[PDB]
mmCIF file of C-alpha atoms and ligand atoms in Angstrom:
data_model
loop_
_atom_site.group_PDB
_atom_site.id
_atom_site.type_symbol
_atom_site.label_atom_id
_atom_site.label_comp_id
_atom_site.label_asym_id
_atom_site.label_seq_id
_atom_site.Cartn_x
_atom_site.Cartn_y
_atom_site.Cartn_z
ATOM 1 C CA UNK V 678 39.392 18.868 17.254
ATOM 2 C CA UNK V 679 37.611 16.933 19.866
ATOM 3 C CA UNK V 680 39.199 15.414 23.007
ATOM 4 C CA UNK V 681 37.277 13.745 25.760
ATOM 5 C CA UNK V 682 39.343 12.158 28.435
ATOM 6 C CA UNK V 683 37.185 11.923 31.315
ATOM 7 C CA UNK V 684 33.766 11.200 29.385
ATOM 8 C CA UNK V 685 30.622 12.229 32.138
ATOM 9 C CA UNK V 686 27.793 13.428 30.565
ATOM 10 C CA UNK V 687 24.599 14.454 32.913
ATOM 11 C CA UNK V 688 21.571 15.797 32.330
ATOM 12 C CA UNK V 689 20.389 15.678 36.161
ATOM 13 C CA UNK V 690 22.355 18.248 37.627
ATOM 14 C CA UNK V 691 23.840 16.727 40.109
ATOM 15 C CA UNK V 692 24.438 11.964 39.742
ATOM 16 C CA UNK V 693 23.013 9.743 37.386
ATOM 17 C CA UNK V 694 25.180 10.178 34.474
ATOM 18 C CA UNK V 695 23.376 9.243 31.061
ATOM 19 C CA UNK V 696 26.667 8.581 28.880
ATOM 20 C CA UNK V 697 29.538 7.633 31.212
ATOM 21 C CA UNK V 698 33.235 6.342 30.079
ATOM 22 C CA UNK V 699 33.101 7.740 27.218
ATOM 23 C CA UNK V 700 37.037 8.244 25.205
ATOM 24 C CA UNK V 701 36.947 9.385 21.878
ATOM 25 C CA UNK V 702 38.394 11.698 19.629
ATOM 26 C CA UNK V 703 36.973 13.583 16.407
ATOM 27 C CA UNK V 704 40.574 15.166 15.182
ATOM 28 C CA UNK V 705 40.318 17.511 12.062
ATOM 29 C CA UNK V 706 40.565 16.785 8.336
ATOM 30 C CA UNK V 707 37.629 14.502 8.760
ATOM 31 C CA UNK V 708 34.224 12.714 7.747
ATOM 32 C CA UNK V 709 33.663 10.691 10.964
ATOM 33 C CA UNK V 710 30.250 8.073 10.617
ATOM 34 C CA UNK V 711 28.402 6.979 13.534
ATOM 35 C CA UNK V 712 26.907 3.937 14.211
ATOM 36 C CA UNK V 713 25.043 2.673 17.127
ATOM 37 C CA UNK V 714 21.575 1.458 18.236
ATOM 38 C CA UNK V 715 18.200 3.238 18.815
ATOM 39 C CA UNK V 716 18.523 4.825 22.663
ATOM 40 C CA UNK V 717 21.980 4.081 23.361
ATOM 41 C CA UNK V 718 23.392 7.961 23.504
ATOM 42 C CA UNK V 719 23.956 8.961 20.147
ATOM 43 C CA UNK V 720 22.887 12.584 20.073
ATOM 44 C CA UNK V 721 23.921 13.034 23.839
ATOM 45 C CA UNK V 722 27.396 12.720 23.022
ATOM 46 C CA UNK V 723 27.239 14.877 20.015
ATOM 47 C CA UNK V 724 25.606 17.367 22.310
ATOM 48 C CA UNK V 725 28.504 17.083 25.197
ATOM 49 C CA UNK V 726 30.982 17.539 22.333
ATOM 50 C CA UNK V 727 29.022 20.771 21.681
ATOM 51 C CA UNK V 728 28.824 21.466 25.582
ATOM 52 C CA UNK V 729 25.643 22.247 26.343
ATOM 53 C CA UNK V 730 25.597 18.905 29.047
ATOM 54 C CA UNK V 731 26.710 19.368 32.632
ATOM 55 C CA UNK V 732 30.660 18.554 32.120
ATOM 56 C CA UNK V 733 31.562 17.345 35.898
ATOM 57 C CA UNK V 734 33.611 14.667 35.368
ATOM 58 C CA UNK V 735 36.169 14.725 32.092
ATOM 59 C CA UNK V 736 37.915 16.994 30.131
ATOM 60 C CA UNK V 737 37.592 19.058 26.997
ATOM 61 C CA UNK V 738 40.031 20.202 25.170
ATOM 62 C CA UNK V 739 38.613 21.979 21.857
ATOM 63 C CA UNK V 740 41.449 23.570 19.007
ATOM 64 C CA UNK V 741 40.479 23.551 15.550
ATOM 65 C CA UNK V 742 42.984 23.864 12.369
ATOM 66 C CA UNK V 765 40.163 24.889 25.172
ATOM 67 C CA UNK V 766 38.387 27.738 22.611
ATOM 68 C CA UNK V 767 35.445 26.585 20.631
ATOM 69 C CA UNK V 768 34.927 27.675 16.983
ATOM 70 C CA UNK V 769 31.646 28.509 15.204
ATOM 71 C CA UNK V 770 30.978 24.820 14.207
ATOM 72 C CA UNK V 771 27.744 23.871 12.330
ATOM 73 C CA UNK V 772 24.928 21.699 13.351
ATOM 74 C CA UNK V 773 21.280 20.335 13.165
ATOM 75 C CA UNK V 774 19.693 18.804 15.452
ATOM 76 C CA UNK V 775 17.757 15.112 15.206
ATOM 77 C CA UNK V 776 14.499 17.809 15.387
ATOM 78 C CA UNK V 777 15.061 20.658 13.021
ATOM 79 C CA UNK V 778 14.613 23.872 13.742
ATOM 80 C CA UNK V 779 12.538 26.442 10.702
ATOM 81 C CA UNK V 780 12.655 29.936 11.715
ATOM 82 C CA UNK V 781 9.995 31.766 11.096
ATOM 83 C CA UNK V 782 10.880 33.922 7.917
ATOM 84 C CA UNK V 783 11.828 33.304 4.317
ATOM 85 C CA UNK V 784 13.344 29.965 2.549
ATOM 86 C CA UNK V 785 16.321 32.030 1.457
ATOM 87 C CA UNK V 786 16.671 33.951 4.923
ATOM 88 C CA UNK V 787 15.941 30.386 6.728
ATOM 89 C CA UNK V 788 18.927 28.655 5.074
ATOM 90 C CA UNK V 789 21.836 31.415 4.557
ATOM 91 C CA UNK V 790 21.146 32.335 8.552
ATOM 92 C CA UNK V 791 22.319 36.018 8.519
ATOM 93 C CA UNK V 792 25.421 35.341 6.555
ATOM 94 C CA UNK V 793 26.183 36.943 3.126
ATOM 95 C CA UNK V 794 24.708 35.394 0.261
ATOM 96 C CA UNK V 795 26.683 34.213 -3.009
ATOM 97 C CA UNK V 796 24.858 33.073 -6.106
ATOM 98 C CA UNK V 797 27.569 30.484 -6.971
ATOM 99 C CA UNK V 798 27.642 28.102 -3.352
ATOM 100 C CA UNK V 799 23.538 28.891 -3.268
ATOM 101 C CA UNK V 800 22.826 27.383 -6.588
ATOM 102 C CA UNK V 801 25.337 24.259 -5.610
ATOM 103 C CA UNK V 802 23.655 23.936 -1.804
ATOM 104 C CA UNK V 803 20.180 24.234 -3.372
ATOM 105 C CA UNK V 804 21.152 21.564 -5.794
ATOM 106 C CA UNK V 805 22.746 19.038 -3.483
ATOM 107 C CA UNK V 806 19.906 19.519 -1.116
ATOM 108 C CA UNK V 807 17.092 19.449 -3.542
ATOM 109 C CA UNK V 808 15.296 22.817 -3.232
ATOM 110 C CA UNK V 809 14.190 23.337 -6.397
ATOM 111 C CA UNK V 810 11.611 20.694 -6.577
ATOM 112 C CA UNK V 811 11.231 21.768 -2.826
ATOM 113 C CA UNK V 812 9.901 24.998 -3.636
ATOM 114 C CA UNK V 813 8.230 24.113 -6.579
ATOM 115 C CA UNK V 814 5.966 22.130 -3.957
ATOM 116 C CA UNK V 815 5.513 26.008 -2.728
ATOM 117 C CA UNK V 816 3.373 29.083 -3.795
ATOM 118 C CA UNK V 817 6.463 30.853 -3.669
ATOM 119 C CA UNK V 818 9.557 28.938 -2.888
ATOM 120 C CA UNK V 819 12.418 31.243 -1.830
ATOM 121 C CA UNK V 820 10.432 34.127 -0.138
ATOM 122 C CA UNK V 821 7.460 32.255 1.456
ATOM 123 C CA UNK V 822 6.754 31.840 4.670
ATOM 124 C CA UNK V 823 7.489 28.407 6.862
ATOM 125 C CA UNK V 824 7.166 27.300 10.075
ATOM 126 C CA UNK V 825 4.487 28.512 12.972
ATOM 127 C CA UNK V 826 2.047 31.564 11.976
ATOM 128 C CA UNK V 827 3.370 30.564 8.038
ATOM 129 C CA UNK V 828 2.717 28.453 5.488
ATOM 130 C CA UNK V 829 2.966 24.692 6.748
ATOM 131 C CA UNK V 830 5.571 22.402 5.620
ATOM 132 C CA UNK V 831 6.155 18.408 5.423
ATOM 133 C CA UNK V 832 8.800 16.584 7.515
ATOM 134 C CA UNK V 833 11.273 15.880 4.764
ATOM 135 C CA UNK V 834 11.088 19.121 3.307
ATOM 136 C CA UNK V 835 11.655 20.768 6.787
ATOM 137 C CA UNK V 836 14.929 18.043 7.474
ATOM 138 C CA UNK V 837 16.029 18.826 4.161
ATOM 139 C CA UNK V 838 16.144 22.536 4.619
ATOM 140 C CA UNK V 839 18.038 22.226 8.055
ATOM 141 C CA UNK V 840 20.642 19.774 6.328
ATOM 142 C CA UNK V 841 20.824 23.071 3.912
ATOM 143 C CA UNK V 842 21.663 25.137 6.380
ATOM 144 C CA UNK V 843 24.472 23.480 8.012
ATOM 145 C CA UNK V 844 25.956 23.073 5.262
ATOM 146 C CA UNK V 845 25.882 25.998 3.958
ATOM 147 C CA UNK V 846 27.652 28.280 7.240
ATOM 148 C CA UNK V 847 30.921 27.348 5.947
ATOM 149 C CA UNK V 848 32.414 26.133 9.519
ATOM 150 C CA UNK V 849 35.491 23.951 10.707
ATOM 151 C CA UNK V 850 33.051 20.973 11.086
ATOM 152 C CA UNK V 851 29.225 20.119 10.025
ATOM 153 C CA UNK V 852 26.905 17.762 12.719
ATOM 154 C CA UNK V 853 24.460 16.021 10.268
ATOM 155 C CA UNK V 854 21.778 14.558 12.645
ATOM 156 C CA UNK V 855 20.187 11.560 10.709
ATOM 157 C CA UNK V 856 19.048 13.745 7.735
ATOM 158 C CA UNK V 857 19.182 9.912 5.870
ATOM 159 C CA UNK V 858 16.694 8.253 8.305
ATOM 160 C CA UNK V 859 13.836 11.272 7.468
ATOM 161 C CA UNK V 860 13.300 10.392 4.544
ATOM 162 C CA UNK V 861 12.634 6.688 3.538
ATOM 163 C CA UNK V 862 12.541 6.903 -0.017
ATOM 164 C CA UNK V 863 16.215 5.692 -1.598
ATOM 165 C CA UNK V 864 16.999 9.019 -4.092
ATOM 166 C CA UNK V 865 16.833 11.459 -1.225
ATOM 167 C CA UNK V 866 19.060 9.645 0.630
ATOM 168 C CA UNK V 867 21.075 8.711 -2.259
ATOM 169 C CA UNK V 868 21.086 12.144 -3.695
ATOM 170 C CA UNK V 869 21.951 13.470 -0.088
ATOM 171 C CA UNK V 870 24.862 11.296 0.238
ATOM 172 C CA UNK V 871 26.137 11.880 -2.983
ATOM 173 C CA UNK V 872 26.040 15.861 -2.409
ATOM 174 C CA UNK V 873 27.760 15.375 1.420
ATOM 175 C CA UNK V 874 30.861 13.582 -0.679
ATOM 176 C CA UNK V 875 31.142 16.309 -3.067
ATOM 177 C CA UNK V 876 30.936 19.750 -0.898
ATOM 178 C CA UNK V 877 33.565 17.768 1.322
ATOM 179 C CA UNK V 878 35.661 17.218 -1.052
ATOM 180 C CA UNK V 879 35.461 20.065 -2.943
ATOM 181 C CA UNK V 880 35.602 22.471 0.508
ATOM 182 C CA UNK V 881 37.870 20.567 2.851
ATOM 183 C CA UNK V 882 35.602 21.084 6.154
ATOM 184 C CA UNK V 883 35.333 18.347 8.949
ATOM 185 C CA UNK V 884 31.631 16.413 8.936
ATOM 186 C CA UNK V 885 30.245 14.033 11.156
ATOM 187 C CA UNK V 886 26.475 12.198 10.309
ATOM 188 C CA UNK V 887 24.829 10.533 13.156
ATOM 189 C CA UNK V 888 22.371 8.361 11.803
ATOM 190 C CA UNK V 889 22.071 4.721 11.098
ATOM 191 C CA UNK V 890 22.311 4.283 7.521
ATOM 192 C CA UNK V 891 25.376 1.877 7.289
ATOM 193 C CA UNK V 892 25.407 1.339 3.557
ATOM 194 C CA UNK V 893 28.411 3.615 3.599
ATOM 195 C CA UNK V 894 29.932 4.066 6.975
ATOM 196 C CA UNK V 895 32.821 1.432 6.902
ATOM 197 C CA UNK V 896 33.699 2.677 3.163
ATOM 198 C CA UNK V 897 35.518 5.639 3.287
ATOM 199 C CA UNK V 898 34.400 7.075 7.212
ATOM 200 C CA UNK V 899 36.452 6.639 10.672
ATOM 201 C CA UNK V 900 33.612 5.222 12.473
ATOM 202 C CA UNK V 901 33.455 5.295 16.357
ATOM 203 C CA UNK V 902 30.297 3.452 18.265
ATOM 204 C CA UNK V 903 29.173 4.893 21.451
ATOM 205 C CA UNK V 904 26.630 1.725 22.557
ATOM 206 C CA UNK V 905 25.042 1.358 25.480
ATOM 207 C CA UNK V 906 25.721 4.350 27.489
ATOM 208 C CA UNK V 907 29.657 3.515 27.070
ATOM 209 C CA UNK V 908 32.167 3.979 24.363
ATOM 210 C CA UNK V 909 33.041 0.590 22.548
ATOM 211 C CA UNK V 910 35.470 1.749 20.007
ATOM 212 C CA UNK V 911 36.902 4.953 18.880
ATOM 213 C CA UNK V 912 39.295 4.055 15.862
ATOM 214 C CA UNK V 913 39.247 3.746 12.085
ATOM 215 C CA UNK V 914 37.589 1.886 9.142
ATOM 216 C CA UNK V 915 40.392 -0.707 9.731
ATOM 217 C CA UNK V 916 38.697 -1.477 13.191
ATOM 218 C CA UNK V 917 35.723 -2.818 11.008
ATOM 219 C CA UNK V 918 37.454 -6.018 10.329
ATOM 220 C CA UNK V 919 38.718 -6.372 13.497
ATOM 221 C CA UNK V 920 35.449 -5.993 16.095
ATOM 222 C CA UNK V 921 33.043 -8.939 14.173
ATOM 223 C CA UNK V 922 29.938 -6.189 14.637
ATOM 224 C CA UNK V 923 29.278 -5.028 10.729
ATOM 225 C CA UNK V 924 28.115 -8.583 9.669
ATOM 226 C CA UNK V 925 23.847 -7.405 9.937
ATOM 227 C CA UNK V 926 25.232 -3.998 8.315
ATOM 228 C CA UNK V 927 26.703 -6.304 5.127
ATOM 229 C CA UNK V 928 23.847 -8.348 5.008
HETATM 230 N N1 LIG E 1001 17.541 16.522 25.827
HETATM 231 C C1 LIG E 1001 17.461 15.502 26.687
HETATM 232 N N2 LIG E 1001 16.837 15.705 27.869
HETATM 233 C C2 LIG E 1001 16.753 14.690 28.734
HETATM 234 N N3 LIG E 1001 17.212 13.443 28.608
HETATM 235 C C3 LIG E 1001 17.824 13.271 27.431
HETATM 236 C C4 LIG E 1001 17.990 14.221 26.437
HETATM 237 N N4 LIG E 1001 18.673 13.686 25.355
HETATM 238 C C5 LIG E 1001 18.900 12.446 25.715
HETATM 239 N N5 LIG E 1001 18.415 12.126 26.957
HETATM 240 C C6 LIG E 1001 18.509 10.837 27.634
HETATM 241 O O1 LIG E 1001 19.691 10.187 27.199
HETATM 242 C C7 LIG E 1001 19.362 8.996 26.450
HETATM 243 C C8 LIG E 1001 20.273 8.886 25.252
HETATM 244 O O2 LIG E 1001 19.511 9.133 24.052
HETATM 245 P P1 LIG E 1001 20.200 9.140 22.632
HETATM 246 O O3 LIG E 1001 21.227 10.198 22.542
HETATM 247 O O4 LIG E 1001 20.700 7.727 22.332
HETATM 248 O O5 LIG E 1001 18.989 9.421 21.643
HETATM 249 P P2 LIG E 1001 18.692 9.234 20.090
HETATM 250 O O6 LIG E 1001 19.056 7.883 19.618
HETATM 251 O O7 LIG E 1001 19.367 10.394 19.359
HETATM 252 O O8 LIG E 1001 17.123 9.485 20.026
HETATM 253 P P3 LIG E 1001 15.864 9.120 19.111
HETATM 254 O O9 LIG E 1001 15.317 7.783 19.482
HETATM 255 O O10 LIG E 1001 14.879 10.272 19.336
HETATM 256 O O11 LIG E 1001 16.398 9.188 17.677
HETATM 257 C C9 LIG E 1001 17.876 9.118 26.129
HETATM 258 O O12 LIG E 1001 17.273 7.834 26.013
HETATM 259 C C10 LIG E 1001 17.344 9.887 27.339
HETATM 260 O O13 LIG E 1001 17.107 9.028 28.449
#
């Protein structure tokens, strides 16, 4: 799906590039991992990808399974509009009782809006009914996954919550609407207790692309000994 030749990404518009060099690939049939430090230009090169950066010096060619599809994502910062739980998650898209029950599962909403006077028709966000920061990343994850698109941008929904059985119970629900839908994923976080399992890493450290490859890679760069350890 993706294809980045060139790799410039700006956000001055004009010099200075903040992610330069950069050649990777995220083809389809997917569940791509990414690892990489704090500040290196993580969520800058998910947002070129998505091009909404000044593209001056690279390519893009964008097909999915140059014309874009609807593809899913959240970003780092999630985004609540202001309405219902149920109108904040299905986004203006028609609503099934069998995938709602299975998203609401996965992603925990139950006890969510049990935490709520009225769960799936109260009101969140500004001028509403406040909310806590791993309920709010929670519902966002929800969302994403729930569109139904050629691909799904998970921006580290593991590192918002620091207690184990979110995270746990997240990643366990990410395996099983993958599998069980066949749609493209990629999480950018840092959680590496699964990423050179069963994902096609590729690290983009340092304002620079390092590697763009496979799990196989992993025993061949001498980088994932802190992540086993
Ligand atoms: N929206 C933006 N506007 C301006 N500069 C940006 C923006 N996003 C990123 N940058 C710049 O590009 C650099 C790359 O940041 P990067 O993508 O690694 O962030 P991150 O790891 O996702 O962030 P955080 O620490 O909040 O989790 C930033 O340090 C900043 O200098």
């Amino acid at each position: 799906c993706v294809q980045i030749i060139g790799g410039f990404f700006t956000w001055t518009p004009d010099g200075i590039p903040t992610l330069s060099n950069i050649t990777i690939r995220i083809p389809r049939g997917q569940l791509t991992m990414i690892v990489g430090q704090v500040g290196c230009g993580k969520s800058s090169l998910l947002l070129a990808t998505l091009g909404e950066m000044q593209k001056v010096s690279g390519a893009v060619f964008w097909n999915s399974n140059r014309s874009r599809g609807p593809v899913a994502y959240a970003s780092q910062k999630p985004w609540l509009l202001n309405a219902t739980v149920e109108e904040n998650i299905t986004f203006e898209s028609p609503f099934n009782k069998q995938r709602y029950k299975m998203v609401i599962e996965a992603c925990s909403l139950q006890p969510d809006i049990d935490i709520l006077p009225h769960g799936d028709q109260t009101q969140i966000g500004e001028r509403g009914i406040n909310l806590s920061g791993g309920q709010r990343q929670r519902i966002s994850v929800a969302r994403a996954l729930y569109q139904q698109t050629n691909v799904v941008f998970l921006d580290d929904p593991f590192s918002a919550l620091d207690v184990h059985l979110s995270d746990h119970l997240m990643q366990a629900g990410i395996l099983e609407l993958l599998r069980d839908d066949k749609r493209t994923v990629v999480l950018v976080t840092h959680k590496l207790q699964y990423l050179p399992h069963a994902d096609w890493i590729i690290a983009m450290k340092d304002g620079t692309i390092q590697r763009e490859g496979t799990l196989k890679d992993f025993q061949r760069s001498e980088c994932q000994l802190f992540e086993h350890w």
